[PDB]
């Protein structure tokens, strides 16, 4: 199934029917900082498996839904289990679920994720504003938008230089000086890491040369296609270890550890994204 | 269809019946720079769609043909309309038209692109004498001999150190010096970004370090698809921008631009390669 | 086919059937390289077109054997005929064979390879003990693990810190030192280059900043399969060129002189070899 207008027409069809939300805003939280969707009010849970053209997911199971009502007053849709590139999806089954917010209405796209810090000042359990990227996959004909241009959505070349707005970078940091966290934020380059193994402590060391401050496997492909049609992207990574210490000290990298940092910090993420969607001009 | 000598000869005894040219000299013209294909004399233009075992071209659109005529008293064969590897193509579909080029007889392949500048010695206008290549697709798995090896054509393991001819980049120097233009030329080493996005800017910065003089998203393919198979090569970049002065001033990127610099220096371009073609070795 | 349990589980049934040897050792041995394969004693060979589910390779054509028996007195399994990633096999293609060894009780998977030296202190005919890499096709999205993670195997994101065993790397040293040839032996970060171009001049210049010792294509992929399963691995490459030295004086890489080299040090690769086998620790 191509992620063409005709198909994104008929999934957002389907849930306009379904849940009456007309959304100005999205969200894709990151794993185990997805409690913010439980929070959503009058709210409806609508699975992906039922709707038209969304890709399947039943070969990684776990959850898959779409999630639509309010939040501070605001419209919203969430991604409730995000699509990863390293399970083997391809271009066009990532696309569809961002173009399909597209034509529901989404202005402002907010993304989390969980990263591994590469800059030295970087600790577990920072934040980190994501200003700009190294797309290696993109660099090496694995880009998101390889393939025929949709020409509805947005242009055959795409210029990612404002694909991270600016503004709403400043308005992130602005409610975490009015909470006195501050000190936890960060801004910073991120790598994008296809995946699935960790990046390698030679790996790391390497992206300490390239200007690197952040790696990680998700992010980027949603970045690319809410650019291309459009929209405006706030990402923020949660760092979970250092690499570049870790390799110095021979010290092991795991997905354990990275969930009991999530559980860390899972609570003041909620309630940061809460007010930044309050906030959002108008 | 794979790339094989059976399927290239197929293609070939097509050609040959309706053309009756044997060319020595192929050519394959970038965006807003094939003027030169029209003023081919002779001249007798095949359309893909109708060459046995060629890609199909529909997706995307635009022209598709195989010119084949005189320039200068030389027998040539252009290109009009490439291929390029972002619209998703396969490595057997770039590599077939270049196999064909092999068995109509082709010796000398002409190549130019539109790229962007990252050396800091480099405006918008200039010229760009390939000299070697970081192909960020081939090191990641997406080089364009990925597949079984077609020995006919040649070996398994290329060697790419002489892949830029030498004396082919001085007979261009020499011309352009003849007619006064010698300070837009420039000499340099190309990366390879699968595309379709431009560069962003930390990308930009990351070639800079890495010892790149210009970036662009073709040519590569066609070079080595031409070195395995012993024919000889000169590619030229036309320089739209230079990312990195963009990246320290915030300023965009965009085909609108690149296609008024292509305008600006097509007439010239055209004049130089009809001499360059004129003056190849006999 | 899927590297999955159940089809790796098939495989095993039949080779166990057939060859009495439950191994714990296995050995993948790079071009030119493979003497040791015919002195394995009370041997059984194994045509891979024989095995359930192993993968087709007859476009590649040339040897393909599953070879059980004894060296030294320990039990072991040899892939004589490696699979590479630049012929066109899939990840499913690389790992199933890997995952058969793991099913059939393999420990320790000791690998070789050719390869170029890219660090200034490596000469033709040197060993260097691999202690790291560099992964372009793992960074790009072209990872062996990229699909659904086959639980269980391993877990969904592996740590690749400690992939090459040290106490391995300090008994090959160790073996060197008593036979008088540790002036050959050096230790260095492998860099896979997908292939199957050798890498250009430039991008030798590009791993030499980077920190890269030796490049070559082949290896990685088995290592993360090995590892993602528990398997420890020693890997070790033979140099045929100093890709840094040739670059400066426009000196041609081939495969007839890689060959060349593999003849010149295929004994001692052999002698060595068989004296790490006997003295593995049990
Ligand atoms: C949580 C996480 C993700 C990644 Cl890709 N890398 C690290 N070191 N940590
Ligand atoms: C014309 C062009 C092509 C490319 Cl790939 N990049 C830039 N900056 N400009
Ligand atoms: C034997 C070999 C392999 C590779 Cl990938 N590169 C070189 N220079 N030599």
Redesign the pocket.
């Known amino acids: 199934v191509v992620a063409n207008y005709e198909n994104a027409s008929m999934a957002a069809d389907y849930i306009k029917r379904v849940s009456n939300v007309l959304p100005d805003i999205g969200i894709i939280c990151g794993s185990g900082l997805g409690k913010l969707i439980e929070e959503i009010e009058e709210r409806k849970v609508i699975p992906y498996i039922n709707i038209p053209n969304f890709p399947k997911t039943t070969v990684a199971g776990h959850v898959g839904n779409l999630v639509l009502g309010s939040v501070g007053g605001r419209k919203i849709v969430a991604m409730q289990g995000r699509l990863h590139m390293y399970e083997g999806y391809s271009n066009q089954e990532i696309a569809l679920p961002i173009r399909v917010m597209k034509l529901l209405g989404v202005r402002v796209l907010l993304i989390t994720?969980?990263?591994?810090?590469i800059n030295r000042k970087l600790k577990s359990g920072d934040f980190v504003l994501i200003k700009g990227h190294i797309n290696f996959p993109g660099l090496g004909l694995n880009n998101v938008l390889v393939g025929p241009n949709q020409d509805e959505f947005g242009p055959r070349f795409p210029d990612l230089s404002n694909a991270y707005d600016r503004l709403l970078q400043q308005l992130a940091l602005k409610i975490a000086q009015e909470n006195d966290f501050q000190d936890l934020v960060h801004e910073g380059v991120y790598a994008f890491?296809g995946?699935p193994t960790?990046?390698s402590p030679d790996e790391?060391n390497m992206l300490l040369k390239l200007g690197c401050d952040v790696?990680?496997?998700?992010t980027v492909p949603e970045v690319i296609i809410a650019c291309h049609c459009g929209i405006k992207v706030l990402a923020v990574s949660?760092?979970?270890?250092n690499?570049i210490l870790?390799a110095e000290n021979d010290v092991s990298?795991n997905?354990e550890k990275?969930l009991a940092?999530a559980e860390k910090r899972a609570d003041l993420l909620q309630m940061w994204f809460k007010e930044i969607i309050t906030r959002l001009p108008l």
Not at 113 to 117: E, I, R, S, V
Not at 238 to 241: F, G, P, Q, R, S
Request: charged content about 10%.
């Open positions: 994720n969980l990263a591994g810090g890491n995946g960790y990046e790391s790696v990680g496997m998700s949660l760092i979970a270890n690499s870790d990298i997905h990275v940092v």
